[PDB]
Structures are given as C-alpha cells and as structure tokens.
Amino acid sequence: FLGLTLALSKGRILEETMPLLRAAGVELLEDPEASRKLIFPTSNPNVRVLILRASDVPTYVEHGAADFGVAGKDVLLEHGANHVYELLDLKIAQCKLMTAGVKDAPLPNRRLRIATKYVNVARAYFASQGQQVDVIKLYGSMELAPLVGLGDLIVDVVDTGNTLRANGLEARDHICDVSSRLIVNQVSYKRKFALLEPILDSFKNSINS
Amino acid sequence: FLGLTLALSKGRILEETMPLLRAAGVELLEDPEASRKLIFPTSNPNVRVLILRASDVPTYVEHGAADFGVAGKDVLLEHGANHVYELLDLKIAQCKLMTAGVKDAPLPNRRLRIATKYVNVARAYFASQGQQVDVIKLYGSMELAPLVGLGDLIVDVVDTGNTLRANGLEARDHICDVSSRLIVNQVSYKRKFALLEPILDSFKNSINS
Ligand SMILES: Nc1ncnc2c1ncn2[C@@H]1O[C@H](COP(=O)(O)OP(=O)(O)OP(=O)(O)O)[C@@H](O)[C@H]1O
Ligand SMILES: Nc1ncnc2c1ncn2[C@@H]1O[C@H](COP(=O)(O)OP(=O)(O)OP(=O)(O)O)[C@@H](O)[C@H]1O
Ligand SMILES: O=P(O)(O)OC[C@H]1O[C@H](OP(=O)(O)OP(=O)(O)O)[C@H](O)[C@@H]1O
Ligand SMILES: O=P(O)(O)OC[C@H]1O[C@H](OP(=O)(O)OP(=O)(O)O)[C@H](O)[C@@H]1O
Ligand SMILES: [Mg+2]
Ligand SMILES: [Mg+2]
Numbered sequence: 001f002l003g004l005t006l007a008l009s010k011g012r013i014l015e016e017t018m019p020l021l022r023a024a025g026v027e028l029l030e031d032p033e034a035s036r037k038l039i040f041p042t043s044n045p046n047v048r049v050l051i052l053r054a055s056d057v058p059t060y061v062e063h064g065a066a067d068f069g070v071a072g073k074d075v076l077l078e079h080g081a082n083h084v085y086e087l088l089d090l091k092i093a094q095c096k097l098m099t100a101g102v103k104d105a106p107l108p109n110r111r112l113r114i115a116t117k118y119v120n121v122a123r124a125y126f127a128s129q130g131q132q133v134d135v136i137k138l139y140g141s142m143e144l145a146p147l148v149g150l151g152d153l154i155v156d157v158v159d160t161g162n163t164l165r166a167n168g169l170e171a172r173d174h175i176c177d178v179s180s181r182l183i184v185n186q187v188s189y190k191r192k193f194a195l196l197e198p199i200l201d202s203f204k205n206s207i208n209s
Numbered sequence: 210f211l212g213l214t215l216a217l218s219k220g221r222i223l224e225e226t227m228p229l230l231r232a233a234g235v236e237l238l239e240d241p242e243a244s245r246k247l248i249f250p251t252s253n254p255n256v257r258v259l260i261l262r263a264s265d266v267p268t269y270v271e272h273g274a275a276d277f278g279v280a281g282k283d284v285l286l287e288h289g290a291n292h293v294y295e296l297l298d299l300k301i302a303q304c305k306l307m308t309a310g311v312k313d314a315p316l317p318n319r320r321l322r323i324a325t326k327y328v329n330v331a332r333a334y335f336a337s338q339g340q341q342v343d344v345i346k347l348y349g350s351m352e353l354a355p356l357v358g359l360g361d362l363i364v365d366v367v368d369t370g371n372t373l374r375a376n377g378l379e380a381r382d383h384i385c386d387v388s389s390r391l392i393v394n395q396v397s398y399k400r401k402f403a404l405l406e407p408i409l410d411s412f413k414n415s416i417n418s
Contacts, residue, residue, distance in 0.1 A: 038350055038353040053347075056348055060359060138265050139265055141260075143247070144259065144261075145274070147247075148214065148269070150269060
C-alpha cells in the first residue's frame with residue numbers, strides 16, 4: 001500500500017474526525033463500529049483507516065505502521081510524543097485531566113498514592129505541586145479506586161463530571177485541557193508530504209470554523 | 210465492609226465463575242454487564258463483587274482493595290504473582306499463549322520485533338529459545354500488527370485460532386496453556402480465612418467435577 005494509512009480509535013475520536021475527513025474528500029465505506037475488521041478502505045483510494053485502541057495510535061504512527069493519526073493529548077503526554085510530529089490541535093474530543101477523590105475526604109499526611117492510567121502525567125503534575133507520589137497503575141474504571149481505598153486520589157479525564165458525581169467523587173485539581181491532535185510519522189512527513197499536504201490544509205481550514 | 214470483596218472481569222471470566230459461586234451460595238442480584246455500577250452485592254451479605262478490567266484484578270487483590278479474585282494465568286504471568294497467593298486453577302477461560310505471524314512469511318535474519326500486550330512473557334519465552342528480542346507494547350488488536358508490518362511476530366492468547374485465520378495469520382509456537390486462577394491477598398488469607406475457607410472448599414469440590 002503506497003498511499004496514506006490513518007490511525008483512529010472508536011467512539012468519540014472516530015465520530016468527531018469523520019466530518020473533517022469528509023470535507024477533505026475522505027469517507028469510510030462502512031461503519032467500523034459494526035465490523036471486526038481493522039483495516040478499512042475509503043472513498044479516496046490513496047487513504048485507508050486503521051481502527052486501534054486509543055493507547056496504540058501513537059505507537060503505530062511512531063513506527064510508521066500508520067503515516068498519521070488522531071490521538072488525545074492525554075495519550076500523547078503519557079506515551080511521549082518525541083518521535084512523532086504533532087501538527088494540528090483538532091479541537092475534538094475535548095476534556096480535562098484532573099485529580100479527584102472521595103467528596104470532602106481529608107488527604108492523609110504521608111506520601112500520597114495515586115491510582116491512574118496516566119502514571120507519567122500523575123508524577124509530573126504532583127512534582128509541580130512539590131510532591132513525590134507513589135502511583136498505582138490501573139487500566140480502567142478509575143472512579144472505583146477511591147471507593148475501595150486503592151490510593152488516596154485518582155488522575156483521570158473528566159468531561160461533564162457525571163462519572164465523578166455518580167460515584168461520590170469530586171475533582172480536586174485541574175491538571176490541563178485535553179483535545180485530540182493530528183500526529184504524523186517523522187519519515188512519512190518527509191516522504192509522503194504531497195499526499196499529506198492537501199488533507200492537512202483541509203483539516204486546518206475546517207478547524208478554523 | 211467487613212466481609213469478602215471478590216474481583217472479577219466481564220465476559221468469559223464472569224460467565225464461567227458464576228456457576229462456581231452459585232454452588233458456594235453466592236449469586237449476583239443483577240447482571241453486571243448491563244450496569245455502569247462497579248460494586249455489586251450478592252445473595253450472601255458477606256460477599257461483594259468488583260467488576261474490573263482483567264489487567265486490574267491482580268492489582269486490586271495485591272493491594273487488598275479486593276480480598277480475592279479470578280485472573281487469567283496470562284495476566285498473572287505478565288503482572289507478576291509474587292505478592293498474591295495463587296490457590297486454585299479453576300480450569301475456566303481456557304486458552305493458549307502463542308506466537309503467530311503472517312502465514313508462510315519467512316523470519317528476517319536479525320533481532321526480532323514482537324508486537325504484544327504480553328511483554329514480559331514474550332521476552333521470557335524468546336529467551337528460552339536463545340533469542341534476545343525487541344518488544345513493541347500494544348494494548349489490543351494484536352492480529353493487525355503483522356498485516357501492517359508492525360513487528361515480525363505477535364504474542365497473544367489463542368483459543369479456536371479463528372482470529373488468526375480470519376487475518377491470514379498462523380500460530381508458530383505454543384508458549385503455554387492458560388486458564389483462570391483463584392488469587393488471594395496475602396493478608397486477607399491470614400485475617401479472613403474463616404470467611405474464605407468454605408468458599409475455597411466449594412470451588413475446589415466443584416472443579417473436581
Ligand atoms: N468523556 C470524554 N469526553 C471527551 N473526550 C474524552 C472523554 N473521555 C476520554 N476522552 C478523550 O478521548 C480519547 C479516547 O477515548 P476512548 O474512550 O476511545 O479511550 P479508552 O476508554 O482509554 O479506550 P479503551 O477501551 O482501550 O480503554 C481519550 O484519550 C481522551 O483524549
Ligand atoms: N478466546 C478466548 N478464549 C478463552 N479464554 C480467553 C480468550 N481470550 C482471552 N481469554 C482469557 O480470558 C481473560 C480475560 O479476557 P478479556 O477479554 O476479559 O480481557 P481483555 O480483552 O484483555 O480486556 P480489555 O477489554 O481490558 O482489553 C484473558 O486474560 C485470558 O486468560
Ligand atoms: O466526566 P464524564 O462526562 O463523566 O466523562 C469522563 C469519562 O469519560 C471516559 O469514559 P468513556 O465515556 O470513554 O467510557 P469508558 O470509560 O467505558 O471508555 C473516561 O474513562 C471517564 O470515565
Ligand atoms: O483464538 P480465538 O478463538 O479467535 O480467540 C482469541 C481472541 O480472544 C480474545 O479476544 P476476545 O474474544 O476477548 O475479544 P476482544 O479482543 O475484543 O476482547 C483475544 O484478544 C484474541 O483476539
Ligand atoms: Mg473510554
Ligand atoms: Mg478480550
């Protein structure tokens with residue numbers, strides 16, 4: 001395959017990227033959500049789509065198994081973005097990285113334990129607050145951790161806050177804003193610029209509105 | 210909560226554990242698959258259930274946020290089981306860890322690159338074969354990696370082989386057999402043995418048939 005391979009993840013990123021792609025002349029020929037398939041052609045024969053776990057988008061792009069991808073800033077901060085180029089903030093899948101814990105619970109006076117998927121972000125954020133924390137690596141359902149005493153706080157993405165509130169948790173700190181970013185393989189950017197450029201220019205134009 | 214907290218994961222482990230629990234006098238009062246809730250009571254007021262990602266079951270048990278759990282041997286090998294007790298092989302969710310690649314593709318004569326979730330298992334297995342491999346950490350959809358040239362082989366769990374065959378892959382090596390195991394927190398085993406013992410004895414009796 002000589003064209004461009006685009007890495008996306010299911011749910012919000014796929015849904016919110018599709019209008020950008022459509023305006024750039026690229027449409028999927030079926031719903032990837034209803035298929036076990038992982039490689040999908042598009043209306044443009046020079047563009048195909050991989051459907052990946054959000055965590056794996058940076059990895060496929062870095063290695064060049066995809067030429068470009070749409071990844072959350074949260075995932076990029078955690079993975080490290082040093083071996084891809086971040087070209088555009090697409091302003092989609094907007095949310096916040098936050099700390100949270102049981103509503104009105106006092107923090108213990110000791111080294112804190114942070115239950116999170118975002119281990120590097122947690123360590124970096126608490127380092128800025130003057131705290132060298134322990135982290136408990138989890139892969140999902142962070143909202144449960146404080147309810148069963150696994151760690152003193154969590155770090156997770158928050159949008160509406162409904163998940164926190166549903167579980168009797170409240171946000172303690174805003175860490176940063178998160179949105180999805182267009183990342184490109186550093187070699188693909190040099191070798192396939194002629195294919196990438198009109199798509200990048202389209203995305204840039206679309207996000208300006 | 211003074212009773213026992215049991216960690217399970219959705220899908221096969223939950224489905225195949227339920228008959229064992231039922232025979233031990235423990236039944237869920239609703240389908241956890243149809244709820245956003247993560248803590249569930251049971252017919253026994255001394256037992257509650259956490260529904261976790263399979264990757265997080267060992268973590269909750271190790272820290273004592275759950276007293277015991279059902280985890281795949283694959284997850285235990287990868288996580289490390291040094292700070293929990295593995296008490297029973299429950300003989301459920303049976304599968305194999307295997308290596309696989311594109312059908313009839315020759316291996317390149319260089320350091321191999323293994324795309325896998327099971328990074329520690331991959332390194333250990335290839336070490337037994339006299340190979341010091343590079344690993345590309347992925348979180349899902351391992352079957353895609355060889356189709357886009359991400360790594361030379363994958364390590365993943367295989368049951369029927371249908372996923373491999375669907376994607377033009379074939380298993381190369383059998384690494385080991387996998388089944389779900391009953392793990393216990395090392396402190397809970399000492400402090401709550403009176404609550405655990407009849408349940409463990411029930412499970413043991415059930416699996417003998
Ligand atoms: N509630 C939300 N609102 C808006 N954007 C969100 C929200 N939650 C997550 N995101 C963003 O969307 C990205 C992808 O989320 P997605 O749900 O696909 O990932 P995930 O739940 O980590 O996947 P997995 O099933 O592998 O655990 C996140 O990395 C983040 O940037
Ligand atoms: N096809 C299979 N047949 C039987 N047992 C399996 C199969 N695939 C996985 N297992 C076993 O079941 C366990 C749990 O699998 P499950 O699908 O819940 O995890 P997962 O796909 O890693 O979860 P996640 O959604 O977090 O990626 C595995 O760790 C393994 O031991
Ligand atoms: O602040 P809120 O609006 O409640 O959203 C925050 C939640 O969104 C994400 O879950 P998602 O909706 O992706 O479901 P998942 O965790 O099952 O993937 C994330 O894991 C948070 O739990
Ligand atoms: O050899 P097979 O019978 O094809 O099974 C192997 C597959 O089973 C598991 O997937 P699962 O069914 O758990 O779905 P998931 O990967 O979407 O979780 C695993 O991730 C393999 O892909
Ligand atoms: Mg999600
Ligand atoms: Mg699975």
